[PDB]
Amino acid sequence: NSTSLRKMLANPHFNAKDFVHDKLGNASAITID
Amino acid sequence: RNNVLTTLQRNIESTLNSVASVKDLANEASKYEIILQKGINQVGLKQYTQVVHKLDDMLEDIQSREENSEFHGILTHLEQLIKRSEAQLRVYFISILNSI
């Protein structure tokens, strides 16, 4: 969901950049690639 | 549209590395001990200074991470290459600013 994730979350960094490593941070490094 | 760059592409281009991994920054930071140890005039203005934004911005979310050994070693390699770069900068400042 790079529209929702990329557009809607971290394009203006609202919310912060570490929560993407936290709220989406459970063994999903394939989806981070 | 300059605001579309300056708001969306600004913090988008900032939060590119919102999560980014641990070893790769050591790899390309070491490749910036390749390129940052090529001098200034070989490398060039926003080439050199923007690579300083790449280690500046590679020391970036690591305060946001956690304490392993690669954390402290990459803090050493990063910040000492940073101050090598900064010394080289002010050297070049003074180098032309009494070229008169």
Label residues B90-99 b or e (16+ Cβ within 10 Å = b).
Answer: eeeeeeeeee
Of B18, B64, B65, the CB nearest to A10: B18
Per DSSP, the three-state class of B2 is: helix
List all residues 6 or more positions away from B49 whose beta carbon is below 8 Å from its beta carbon.
B89
Spatial contact of A18 and B23, defined as CB atoms under 8 Å apart: no
- Compute chain B's Rg from CA coordinates: 16
A13–B11: do the CB atoms touch at under 8 Å? yes
Method of determination?
Answer: cryo-EM
Most A CBs within 10 A among B11, B19, B21, B64, hence the mutation to make, goes to: B19
B61–A18: do the CB atoms touch at under 8 Å? yes
Which ranges in chain B belong to alpha helices (H)?
Answer: 2-3, 10-14, 23-35, 45-56, 69-97
Å between A17 CA and nearest CA of chain B: 5
A12 to chain B: which residues are within 8 Å by CB? 7-8, 11-12
* Spatial separation of the C-alpha atoms in residues B73 and B24, rounded to whole Å: 14
> Environment class of residue B19 by beta-carbon count within 10 Å: exposed (0-12), middle (13-18) or buried (19+)?
buried
B13 to chain A: which residues are within 8 Å by CB? none
